[model samples]
Target chain A: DYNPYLLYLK
Target chain B: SIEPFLRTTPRPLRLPDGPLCHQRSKFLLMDALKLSIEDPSHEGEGIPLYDAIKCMKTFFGWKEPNIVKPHEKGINPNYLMAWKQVLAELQDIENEEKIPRTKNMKRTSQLKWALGENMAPEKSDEPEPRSLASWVQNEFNKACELTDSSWIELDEIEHIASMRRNYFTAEVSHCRATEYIMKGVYINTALLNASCAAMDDFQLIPMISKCRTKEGRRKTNLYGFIIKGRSHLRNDTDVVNFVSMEFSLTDPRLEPHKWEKYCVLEIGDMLLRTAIGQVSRPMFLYVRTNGTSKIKMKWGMEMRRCLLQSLQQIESMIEAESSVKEKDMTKEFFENKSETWPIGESPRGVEEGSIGKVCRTLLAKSVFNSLYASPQLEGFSAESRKLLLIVQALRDNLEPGTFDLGGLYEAIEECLINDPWVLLNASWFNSFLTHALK
Candidate 1:
C-alpha cells in the first residue's frame, strides 16, 4: 500500500 | 481568461473610486508581500512582489484602471495614487519606500503615472545607480511622512537577515578559494573577476559533472530552457559561460517558471551551488537554471528538497541490498565449519532427499542464481552483478545475455512454479527448500 514515488523528503 | 476565483468576483478587480476599495487593496497588498517572503525568490524581477500583487489584482479581483489616458497629468485614476500611498504605508518593504521608479535611468515618470496603472513604465535600464538605498531614500522620499530614520534602521535589519539566509542555504557553493580546504586544502573561497579562473587539473568534479550531463537520471529538460532568450557556443556543457540571455527573458513563457520565486540549486563552474534564483544573472554560463519550473518540484525550494531526498533514498536501498547479501554469506559459512564438538540428536524434520532434493535444485536456480542478475541499463552494474552472471552461467547454459531483463525471466519462472499442481502439494519439497539451502 505504500507509494515509493511519494518518498520526496520534503 | 476565466479562472474560477475571478468568475463571480469581477467587481473586486474594478479598482473602484471609493473607501471600501482602499481597505481591500490594503488587504491584498499585505497578502502579496507575505507571499513573496514565504517563497522569497528576490530574483523574480519580472514577477516582483509588487508585480505579483498587481497580477493578483487583475486575475482574482478583475481590477484594471481604464487604459485610456485621462485628463489628469499622467492619464490614470487620481485615486490610484492615494491607494498606492495607503498600501505602501501598510507594509514594511524598505525599498518600496524609496524612489518608486523601477530604475533611475527613466528620463521621465512620476507618482502620477505609476499609481494610476500597473507596470506604468518600462523598468528603466539598471544604469548604475551609484546611490545607496539609504541615500536614495533620504533624497527622493524624505519629504514623505513615512520615510523616517527608524525606517532606515528597520531596512538594515531586514537586509542583514536576508544576507544570513542566503549564506546558510548556500554554504557549500559560496566559497571557491579552498579547492583543498575540503579537498587538498586549496581553500578556494575565490570570488570572480573579469570572470576569472585558475588552472584546475585532476579535478574529480570535472569528470563526475561531465558524466552527469548525459546521465539518465539528470533531466536534460534544459531546466533553464524557459529563461533562455538567446545563446551561443558549445556542443555539450553548462558549467562554462557558454549561454546568455537578455533583460526580458522572463516574458517568454517557455523561459518563465513558478519556481522562479525560490533560491535554486545550480552548479556554475566552482562558485555556485544552490543560490538565490535572482535573474539571468551572475555574468555567464550554461546550466539548468531556466526551466527548473518544468519539473514542478524544481519550481519550489521545498519541492527540490524532495528530489534531493529521493536520491539519498536510492543509495539507502543499495545499502539494504548489501546487508541482505552479508547475512546470506554468514549463514552459508556457519554451515561449513566450527564443528570440533557438537550434539547430534535425533529430532529430524527435513525433506532433503529423493524427489524433493531434485525439485529444490530448480528452486535455487529461480530464487538465488536468477535474482542476483542486474538491470543492464544500470549505470554502475559493477563487480557484484558480474559475479552473479558468472555463477549463473555455470549451472544454467540457457541463461545467455539477450533482450530479456532479469526481472521478467524470474517472473515467468515464478509463475510456472505456482501454476504446477505437484509442487504446491509436496510438503517434503516445500519443507526441505525452506530449512535447507538445496
Candidate 2:
C-alpha cells in the first residue's frame, strides 16, 4: 500500500 | 621481477588528481582459481578477468572524496557470482542437465521450495496461552454477534475498539512515513533510515523524483533554492508567511500537482494561507480569505475547528447511546460534499505534448514539497486523511446496517487501549480548574 501510492502516481 | 603491493597503503588508495584505481590485478588472478573450481561456474574465469579489466580501463577510477569507493566497485563482481549461482541452481533443477542419480529427491525438494510450490512451515514454539486464548475468544465472540440486546452491547463495544486501533495505527504509520520522507528530502539518509524498519518492505524510496533526469535536477536544485531565499528571517512568522505565499502561488498555477506539495499546502492553509478555495465541479465554489489584520486569528480558528471536529467524532463514537447508525451515515454522506476537491489543473493539459510535459514538470515541482523536511509531518497527515476517506467510503453506506459492534470495538482500541496520549479539551479544562483550587 505504501509503495502503491508513489507507483500509481508515476 | 615484481615487488609485493604495500600493505601500508591508505585503505582506499586515493590519488592526487588522477583515477583512484586500486592495484587488483594479482588479487583477480588468485580469485579466478576459486571461481573456476566452483560447481556453479559459468563462462571461463579468465575471460571474466579480462572483462573486468576492460571495464576498469573504460570507466576510469572514481573521485577521491566519494566515500566507500572500494565498496562501490565490488557490486559488479557480486553480480557475477549471483548469476553463476543462479545458473548452477537452474541446471540442478533440470535433472537432464546435471547428474540426477545422486540426491535427486533432495534436489527436487530444494527446487520446489525455490519455485514457491509449497508454503513454509511455521515454527514449533508453543503458542502463548494468552495469544491463542485471545484468538479463540475473538472467534467465539464473532460467531455470537447476533442482534440480541446482550450481543448488541458487546458488538458496539467491539466495533468501538477496532475503530480506535484503526485510527491510532493509521496516525502512527502516517507520522513514521512523514519523518522518513522529510529526512530524504533534506538528503539526510541516516535520519530517513532511523524511522524506517530494516526490512525492505517498509522503506519508501529515499530518492525523490526518479522518473526523469530533467525533473530530478530541477527539483533538487532549486528548492533548497534560494528558499534559504533569503528567509534569513529573525522572525519565524515572517519566514512562514513568505514560504506559504510561495506555495500558494505554485498551487494556483498547477493541476494534478504533487501530493507532497498538497500536504504542505493543506498545512499552510490550516496554519498560514489567507485565502482558500473550496471548489465544486468546474463552476460553484466558495473562497474564504482572511483579512490581513485577521490572519493569525483565522489560523487559530481553523485549528480549533479541526480539533473540535476530531473531538466531536471521538465523543460521538464513545457515547453509543447518542446517535443511531442511519443518521450518522447521512451526516457522513453530507460532509463528503465539503471535502471533495475541484482545484486548478496545470494550464497545458488542454494543449499538446509539450504542454503536457510542461504541466508534468510543474507537477513535479509541486511534488518536491513532499520531500521537504518541514512538510513531511503534514504529508503523513494527508495520507491518514486519505485512508480515513477510504474507510469512510467502505463503512458509510446507504443501507440501514447496524455497525454498533464494529464502532464500539474501534472506539475502545483508539481511546482506552492505544498509547496515543489523547485528551479532550473538557478533561484538560477540568484538570486546570481542579489544580487552581489547590
Off by over 4 Å in 2: A1-10, B1-163, B167-226, B240-438
Off by over 4 Å in 1: A1-10, B1-303, B306-311, B314-318, B321-438
TM per candidate = 0.17, 0.17
Can you give the DockQ of every candidate in the order shown? 0.06, 0.03
Candidate 2 C-alpha lDDT tens digits along B1-438: 123252111111111222111211000100010001111233221222222222222322212211111123123233223223333433454445332211112223322222113323323011211111122112112221221111000123566445543442232222212222232333222112322222111111111111112121111110110000111222323321101101122232222211112111111111123347442211100011111112222232232133223334444433452364433332332223332211112223111222112222222222222221122224333433333333334333322222343543243223221111111111222222222222
lDDT of 1 by residue, B1-438 (tens): 344353221010011121110010000101111111122233322322243333223322222222211222332333233223323432433346442311111111333232112222223111221111122112111111110011000114464334432322222121211110111111011111111221111000100000011111211001111111111111222121111111111211222221121221111212224467433322111111121111111112122132233234333533454487753222222233331111111135321222112121222222111111122212122322432353344224334443434443343223222111111212222232232222
Worst 10 residues of 2 chain B by lDDT: B26-35
True contacts kept of each: 0.00, 0.00
Best by DockQ: 1
Instruction: Name the top TM-score candidate.
Output: 1
lDDT for model 2 comes to 0.22
